């Protein structure tokens, strides 16, 4: 039996949660068991929790968003401190959201900047033209270039991680799905200010799951945004939410969404 504790570090919106979900194969600490290997992924908040996770880490996966022009050119100082104090733990660089890059050859230069020209103890000599606060981390064991959103080559990282292993409520679910749909469809802060209240949850005469959920908001403009033109917006949400539920509980579900102002 082989086990590997891997901790995900990086910027807030570097996609750590997305990559963890893709590795797990489900949108959810996570455990990936395959044959005789067990990989424990520890998702940490973006930059006390990351350091405490490092205290029990066998491998570190440093995610960098290449699409973000502001932060792609350097590793954040706190991340560099984290790696320096735990230099003994192996670290692997993952350049996420490559699909968003228009000119992807840029990646190459970024590597030289992020790895300081050294990877896995070997220098990255590169044909050289015609003749202090650290910016990178020269002790990365390996480099990956992937896009977690499209699952592009996440399988390669999964197989790599498997290789480095060393011998050794339903109402809540429905609320989470509705929250996801609200986030996807509603603008700005509105989906963060919607309170949900389960009104009816029962089994109908035909074996279906009859759900009536109430969407409470503090403002009338939020009600208008929720209902949308001619009731389209809310309607769309319900159907999509219902469709997701079709796959989660494996039955027929009649979900009805009603919007009321918080008094």
């Amino acid at each position: 039996s082989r086990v590997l504790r891997v901790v995900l570090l990086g910027a807030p919106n570097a996609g750590k949660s997305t990559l963890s979900n893709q590795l797990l194969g489900r949108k959810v600490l996570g455990v990936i068991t395959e044959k005789e290997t067990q990989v424990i992924l520890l998702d940490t908040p973006g930059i006390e929790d990351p350091w405490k996770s490092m205290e029990s880490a066998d491998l570190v996966v440093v995610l960098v968003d290449v699409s973000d022009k502001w932060t792609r050119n350097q590793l954040s100082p706190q991340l560099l401190r984290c790696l320096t104090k735990y230099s003994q733990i192996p670290s692997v660089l993952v350049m996420n959201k490559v699909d968003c890059l228009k000119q992807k050859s840029v990646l190459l230069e970024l590597t030289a900047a992020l790895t300081e020209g050294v990877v896995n103890g070997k220098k990255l000599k590169m044909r050289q033209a015609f003749h202090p606060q650290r910016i990178g981390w020269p002790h990365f064991k390996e480099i990956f270039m992937l896009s977690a959103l499209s699952q592009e080559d996440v399988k390669t990282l999964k197989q790599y991680l498997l290789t480095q292993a060393q011998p050794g409520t339903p109402e809540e679910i429905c609320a989470n799905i509705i929250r996801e749909k609200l986030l996807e469809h509603l603008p700005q802060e509105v989906p963060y200010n919607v309170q949900q209240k389960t009104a009816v949850w029962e089994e109908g005469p035909g074996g279906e799951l009859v759900i009536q959920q109430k969407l409470l908001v503090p403002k009338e403009s939020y009600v208008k945004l929720l209902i949308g033109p001619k009731g389209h917006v809310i309607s769309q949400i319900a159907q999509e939410a219902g469709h997701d539920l079709m796959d989660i509980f494996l039955c027929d579900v009649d979900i009805r969404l009603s919007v009321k102002l918080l008094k």
Binding site: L107, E109, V119, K122, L124, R127, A129, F130, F144, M145
Partner: protein, 208 residues
């Protein structure tokens, strides 16, 4: 080109045309009917319907050509095949009863397996940005690796360290070395596989 865009390449395969109408799929049937309408180019000097035709040996001969001298290139190729055949017969006649079952005497099998043993799987492609060409590992296509095996064999046989040893004898010896996973060409394949593992930093660029 003196040919119009309309003209299509000919298909010299002889067993393709004898395929019975019954085995024809609707798609293959449609292709057969479509070729009836098209204009076809004259078959070039070279490939024929002969059963001894071998495209790989033809390409090797063309790659040994210098100055359009095809007679000499083919003469060298047939001399090499004859030398391989004679050396294997020599080794077979001097071998024990139990070593004779594992001695290959067909020069074509030896040539094909020797070239297959020299094909690389990975290579390096330079890419341009920042003023610095970047050497990224790349999985070679089948055409590229088949070409590289032949090019390495011919360059190894053209080395000037082989003073007055005639090309057929050098090439037969090199082919028989590569048949057994030995020689400088196998080492040149290994030194590229190691120099591509030494540079796995840029190992995932998929858009060379």
């Amino acid at each position: 080109s003196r040919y119009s865009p309309e003209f299509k390449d000919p298909l010299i395969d002889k067993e393709y045309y004898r395929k019975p109408v019954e085995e024809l799929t609707e798609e293959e049937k449609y292709v057969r009917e479509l070729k009836k309408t098209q204009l076809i180019k004259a078959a070039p000097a070279g490939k024929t319907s002969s059963v001894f035709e071998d495209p790989v040996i033809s390409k090797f001969t063309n790659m040994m050509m210098i100055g359009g001298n095809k007679v000499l290139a083919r003469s060298l190729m047939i001399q090499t095949l004859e030398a391989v055949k004679r050396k294997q017969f020599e080794k077979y006649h001097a071998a024990s009863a139990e070593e004779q079952a594992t001695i290959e005497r067909n020069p074509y099998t030896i040539f094909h397996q020797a070239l297959k043993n020299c094909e690389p799987m990975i290579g390096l492609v330079p890419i341009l940005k920042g003023g610095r060409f970047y050497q990224v590992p790349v999985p070679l296509p089948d055409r590229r690796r088949r070409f590289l095996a032949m090019k390495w064999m011919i360059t190894e046989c053209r080395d000037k360290k082989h003073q007055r040893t005639l090309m057929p004898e050098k090439l037969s010896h090199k082919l028989l070395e590569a048949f057994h996973n030995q020689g400088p060409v196998i080492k040149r394949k290994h030194d590229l596989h190691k120099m591509a593992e030494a540079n796995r930093a840029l190992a995932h660029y998929r858009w060379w």
